Design a protein around this nucleic acid. Structure first.
Ligand SMILES: [Zn+2]
Lengths: 638, 134
DNA sequence: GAATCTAGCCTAGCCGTTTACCTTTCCTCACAG
DNA sequence: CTGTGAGGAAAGGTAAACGGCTAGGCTAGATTC
């Protein structure tokens, strides 16, 4: 009957038998309003929503001017689709004023994720929520009331925030984080009931307890931990941090039970250190990964090569069972028809959502290779990141337009797309290349360099927002801004530089070039904060100058190097006869913390059993790659 | 070194000077058992003033070995410091297709400059030609 | 039925450490202006 | 009385590669009133 209206066989099969008459009824009105067939099929999980949308649509647009068809369909297909919309048609006007200035997106999100009950609950208690003794910002209210189970976290927060924050002692953001997940009421009650017992008898710090209870599915990990911590720590010989890490994920109770059941079998029959088992069982769906590994290790290790280390590497990510099954299913056809080495397949599959990446590679290798001219290595590099399916599908669509309408070589597009979140970077480049090139005076090479890193979209947006203020009010050339923004986390580095430059240059006597040098590496914000915190301590308690601190911090992981230097300067200078200049020289390269620890551990051996003076080992350690040379070139050959 | 064939054992008389340039010996045979140090001391006139090894004591073999000696070579040195680093490389070109080099006295085992390894290698078989000056 | 609580699976963004591939130095037992 | 050529070694130096963590979303099935 629905074939006449123009529905395909699959779409007709999807619709439930008893709701096809309602579609045949309200099809013409929906098509007139501008809905597609797929939208109508999707808006059928709730049969009562069809009439509500068909009859009342102009009011919906008038109350929500920015709402599109997809948002309306998403809101009106859940278990309370009709009543949520009919409450949005009556509460939206009052919710847009004080005390919560709410926009259309927040209203749609809260409705879709909470239902009519959440909508009316937020509408009623807004005055009590935004005020003493709570003092909650509207964003926190939206975050709390945007989960299936709302209208229960709000009352529990109102009733329990002072009690938790006064007697036990917790920062209010911790309580909000606990209550901002599904079933947060149970989590709050269980924390209130079990915090002192776990903190007194089992010797756990409150931060760990909060970390366990900040996941969906709580109230089950706390009790399971209380029951199973002693037996795991005594019988199987584990450590409390390992148990906490196991239990700090979704379904941690199942992971703990499966670990208890299957640790000896995996550690005896197959051959696997307990660290590998802990690494496997420290992700969402850990029990599935453990059982699948137990089932599939011999077959994959015997019939497909695939040494056990590779299997463990594959299974140590979220959704590690689907990846293993997909690898078992698709290794022969991928290595026998498309000409791919097993290592490439393993590299593709060793990421979150690897099954989708493998399927997309199998689907799109020939078309990319023979219609756009790409080497298989380029496709593998594109697909070897998180969300590689989206990257491949976006490249297939946006390659010719960027290569023709913008004069970009395929190598640049491949370099842009071969990173985490590369789907967004290509669209941002397509949107923002002319504006950045014309209104700011930047060459396309600089734009490509900014965009060719993780989180490049945020970097481009921040550069556009902050180039004039930094260039004019702080005396910085655009080249310095590009250099800061090139690396990963460029937005954070730019914001931290803008916030922290004046006080650093005034209260501490540092030149702007030193700040630029500090902030021009990965994680430069942490380096800047650590320098600001530790410069007066290091320059007064110990004998150091700002140049040495800058040299230590002008490298990757400068925060760790500074903290390690602070911790280990007296120990090395009062027991091994090393001057501070040598310690600074050791720590002024990449991986300086490990170099210092290795030198401390290995100096007595190299001085009492090999015939090497301190200056020689210092000279070995002072160059890049010091741990490797001291640990495996001078201490294992002899 | 103390190993070699032919009508001669393997040892050299040593001259302790510590001043001057160098004193060296050679032991080569083409068809007879005739051999001597050939009064090699330091550098004089050679048709290769551009190559620094052509004035060093070891490198002087090239002259009269490219002309005569396709055989191996034996040398001993009277400078107890070690083989210059310029002759560790740069020496392989200036011989015929195959030849051999020998050891220095144990005293020269205290190098301070770059290179200068003791018990020098056999220095066998490079195939290119010495380059003409200018 | 009406609301609410538990387990798995996929996408982005940020912070540290180790390895492969180029490029700027170092080397005399000589000598000239 | 202080500054010059050929030839492969080691050695500084920037970028690419390889690990691991955190925050947030969406869907299907189970449980309580
Ligand atoms: Zn020489």
């Amino acid at each position: 009957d629905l074939r006449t209206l123009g529905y395909s066989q699959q779409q007709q099969e999807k619709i439930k038998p008893k709701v096809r008459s309602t579609v045949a009824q309200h099809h013409e009105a929906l098509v007139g309003h501008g809905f597609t067939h797929a939208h109508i099929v999707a808006l059928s999980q709730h049969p009562a929503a069809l009439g509500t949308v068909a009859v009342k649509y102009q009011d919906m647009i008038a109350a929500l001017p920015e709402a599109t068809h997809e948002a309306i369909v998403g809101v009106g297909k859940q278990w309370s689709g009709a009543r949520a919309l009919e409450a949005l048609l009556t509460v939206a006007g009052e919710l847009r004023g004080p005390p919560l200035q709410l926009d259309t997106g927040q209203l749609l999100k809260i409705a879709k994720r909470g239902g009519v009950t959440a909508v009316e609950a937020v509408h009623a208690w807004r005055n009590a929520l935004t005020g003493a003794p709570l003092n909650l910002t509207p964003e926190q209210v939206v975050a709390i009331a945007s989960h299936d189970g709302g209208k229960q976290a709000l009352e529990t927060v109102q009733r329990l925030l002072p009690v938790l924050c006064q007697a036990h002692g917790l920062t209010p953001e911790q309580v909000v984080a606990i209550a901002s997940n599904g079933g947060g009421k149970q989590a709050l009650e269980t924390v209130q009931r079990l915090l002192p017992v776990l903190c007194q008898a089992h010797g756990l710090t409150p931060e760990q307890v909060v970390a366990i209870a900040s996941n969906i599915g709580g109230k089950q990990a706390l009790e399971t931990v209380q029951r199973l911590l002693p037996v795991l720590c005594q019988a199987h010989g584990l450590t409390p941090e390992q148990v906490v890490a196991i239990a700090s994920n979704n379904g941690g109770k199942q992971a703990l039970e499966t670990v208890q059941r299957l640790l000896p079998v995996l550690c005896q029959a197959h051959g696997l250190t307990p660290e590998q088992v802990v690494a496997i069982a420290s992700h969402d769906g850990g029990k599935q990964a453990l059982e699948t590994v137990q089932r599939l290790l011999p077959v994959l290790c015997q019939a497909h090569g695939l040494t056990p280390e590779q299997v463990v590497a594959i299974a140590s990510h979220d959704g590690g069972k689907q990846a293993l099954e997909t690898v078992q299913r698709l290794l022969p056809v991928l290595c026998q028809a498309h000409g791919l080495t097993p290592e490439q397949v393993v590299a593709i599959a060793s990421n979150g959502g690897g099954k989708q990446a493998l399927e997309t590679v199998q689907r799109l290798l020939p078309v990319l290779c023979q219609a756009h001219g790409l080497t298989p290595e380029q496709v593998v590099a594109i697909a070897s990141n998180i969300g590689g399916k989206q990257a491949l599908e976006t490249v297939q669509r946006l390659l010719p337009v960027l290569c023709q309408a913008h004069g970009l070589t395929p190598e640049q597009v491949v370099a842009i797309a071969s990173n985490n979140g590369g789907k967004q970077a290509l669209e941002t480049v397509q949107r923002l290349l002319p504006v950045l090139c014309q209104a700011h005076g930047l060459t396309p090479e600089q734009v490509v360099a900014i965009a060719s890193h993780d989180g490049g979209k945020q970097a481009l947006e921040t550069v556009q927002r902050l180039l004039p203020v930094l260039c004019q009010a702080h005396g910085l050339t655009p080249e310095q801004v590009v250099a800061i923004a090139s690396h990963d986390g460029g937005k954070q580095a730019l914001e931290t530089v803008q916030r922290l430059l004046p006080v650093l240059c005034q209260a501490h006597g540092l030149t702007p070039e030193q700040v630029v040098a500090i902030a021009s590496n990965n994680g430069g914000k942490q380096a800047l904060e650590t320098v600001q915190r530790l410069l007066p301590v290091l320059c007064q308690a110990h004998g150091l100058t700002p140049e040495q601190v800058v040299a230590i911090a002008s490298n990757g992981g400068g925060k760790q190097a500074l903290e390690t230097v602070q911790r280990l300067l007296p120990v090395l200078c009062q027991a091994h006869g090393l001057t501070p200049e040598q310690v600074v020289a050791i720590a002024s390269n990449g991986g300086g913390k490990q170099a210092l620890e290795t030198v401390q551990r290995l100096l007595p051996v190299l001085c009492q059993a090999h015939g090497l003076t301190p200056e020689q080992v210092v000279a070995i350690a002072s160059n890049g790659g010091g741990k490797q040379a001291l640990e495996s070139i001078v201490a294992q050959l002899s | 070194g103390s190993y070699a064939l032919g009508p001669y054992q393997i040892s050299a008389p040593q001259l302790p000077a510590y001043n001057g340039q160098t004193v060296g010996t050679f032991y080569y045979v083409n068809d007879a058992g005739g051999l001597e140090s050939k009064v090699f001391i330091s550098g004089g006139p050679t048709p290769y003033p551009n190559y620094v090894s052509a004035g060093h004591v070891a490198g002087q073999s090239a002259l009269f070995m490219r002309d005569n000696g396709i055989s191996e070579g034996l040398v001993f040195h009277n400078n107890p410091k070690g083989t210059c680093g310029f002759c560790v490389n740069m020496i392989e070109t200036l011989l015929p297709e195959n030849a051999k080099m020998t050891v220095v006295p144990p005293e020269g085992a205290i190098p301070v400059k770059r290179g200068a390894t003791g018990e020098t290698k056999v220095f066998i078989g490079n195939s290119n030609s010495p380059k003409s000056p200018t």
